[PDB]
Amino acid sequence: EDDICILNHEKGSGSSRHSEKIAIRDFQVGDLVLIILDERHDNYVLFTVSPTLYFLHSESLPALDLKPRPWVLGKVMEKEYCQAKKAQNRFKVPLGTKFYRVKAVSWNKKV
Amino acid sequence: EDDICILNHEKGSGSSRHSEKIAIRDFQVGDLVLIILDERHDNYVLFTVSPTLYFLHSESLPALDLKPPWVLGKVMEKEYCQAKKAQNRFKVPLGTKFYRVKAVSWN
């Protein structure tokens, strides 16, 4: 263990400080989220661990200082359940796929 | 448009249901975190947007069913460290301050 100095050590189940949190699945309006560029679907999307896609609404881009940056934090304000009606679509997803589109804004708070 | 059909539309500030959530910086003991492989640093780390590295303590790998590409965990312990040698296990410059955490699985 000769390569590091240990400056402090903490154990326990909770603290008085609350880390900043993001949703990663089953997004709800009001959630704080991480918004990343999805090259394959040519769109910004929510970072997520689940296979349902949450696309960022194109009209939310100017409110997140984005342009049609790798990532930004935002706060979900609207959410739309959608189904692909034509086999070639703005979302590069097969015909009939069900997915979400979300509107988000920049947010300088940790909640 | 005409490529998508809108099945429902929701707007608001809150809901009756709680999405699964992870800490993303300034991690605290008790936090739910996302643990990912960081090959640049030859370690697992906590997924984060801050520039401070939070390495997973090698002692925690068996509890998370990992060996020395992502798992959800719960922070049980955290240590503030400073790299003391130029060549170290964490592949950071000499003097770098960073964290090590111990975590257990969570589902």
Side-chain angles (χ1 to χ4, degrees):
Chain A
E1 281 262 346
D2 217 351
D3 59 357
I4 60 159
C5 189
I6 296 190
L7 275 37
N8 70 46
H9 181 253
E10 184 177 34
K11 312 164 143 149
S13 65
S15 75
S16 65
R17 293 255 198 110
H18 287 329
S19 51
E20 179 170 66
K21 320 268 205 288
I22 61 166
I24 55 171
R25 174 183 189 137
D26 303 315
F27 303 90
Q28 306 295 304
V29 298
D31 284 357
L32 196 68
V33 295
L34 178 56
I35 296 161
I36 65 184
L37 179 60
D38 183 311
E39 213 95 11
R40 184 269 170 92
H41 297 104
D42 185 50
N43 272 280
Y44 282 99
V45 305
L46 304 193
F47 171 73
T48 180
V49 291
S50 286
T52 297
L53 291 160
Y54 286 74
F55 293 98
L56 180 78
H57 207 291
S58 45
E59 252 306 271
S60 278
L61 290 184
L64 292 150
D65 200 9
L66 292 178
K67 197 271 324 173
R69 293 163 151 202
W71 61 263
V72 65
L73 291 183
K75 172 146 187 154
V76 179
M77 306 277 287
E78 305 185 17
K79 145 168 91 79
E80 289 180 334
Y81 195 41
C82 313
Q83 186 177 26
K85 225 43 181 194
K86 283 163 171 33
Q88 290 220 155
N89 44 68
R90 285 167 291 159
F91 305 97
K92 317 305 164 184
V93 86
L95 183 279
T97 298
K98 304 196 174 202
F99 60 90
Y100 285 92
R101 218 167 44 159
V102 295
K103 291 180 183 207
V105 303
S106 293
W107 205 251
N108 70 357
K109 267 173 145 37
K110 283 140 151 93
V111 75
Chain B
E1 201 160 78
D2 219 50
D3 56 351
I4 70 182
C5 170
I6 294 179
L7 293 182
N8 69 46
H9 180 70
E10 183 174 44
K11 183 242 211 213
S13 60
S15 83
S16 62
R17 278 167 269 116
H18 298 262
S19 58
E20 165 169 82
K21 298 188 180 56
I22 56 167
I24 213 61
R25 55 180 299 142
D26 298 300
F27 302 91
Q28 304 291 310
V29 298
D31 282 347
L32 299 182
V33 298
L34 177 59
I35 296 158
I36 71 177
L37 180 57
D38 179 2
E39 294 208 53
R40 154 77 179 83
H41 293 112
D42 202 27
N43 279 273
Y44 289 92
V45 301
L46 304 197
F47 180 64
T48 186
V49 299
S50 265
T52 299
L53 293 160
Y54 286 75
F55 293 101
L56 182 72
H57 202 298
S58 42
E59 200 281 319
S60 287
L61 300 166
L64 299 151
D65 198 42
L66 303 163
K67 293 231 152 193
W70 62 266
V71 67
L72 285 185
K74 191 193 213 61
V75 181
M76 296 279 88
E77 206 161 310
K78 70 170 172 75
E79 313 175 341
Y80 194 43
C81 316
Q82 187 157 224
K84 233 174 59 169
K85 300 199 159 53
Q87 194 225 297
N88 47 82
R89 311 166 265 174
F90 309 92
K91 312 298 158 52
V92 292
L94 171 67
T96 303
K97 285 163 177 168
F98 59 92
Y99 280 95
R100 290 200 306 183
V101 307
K102 300 178 181 168
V104 295
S105 211
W106 189 93
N107 288 312

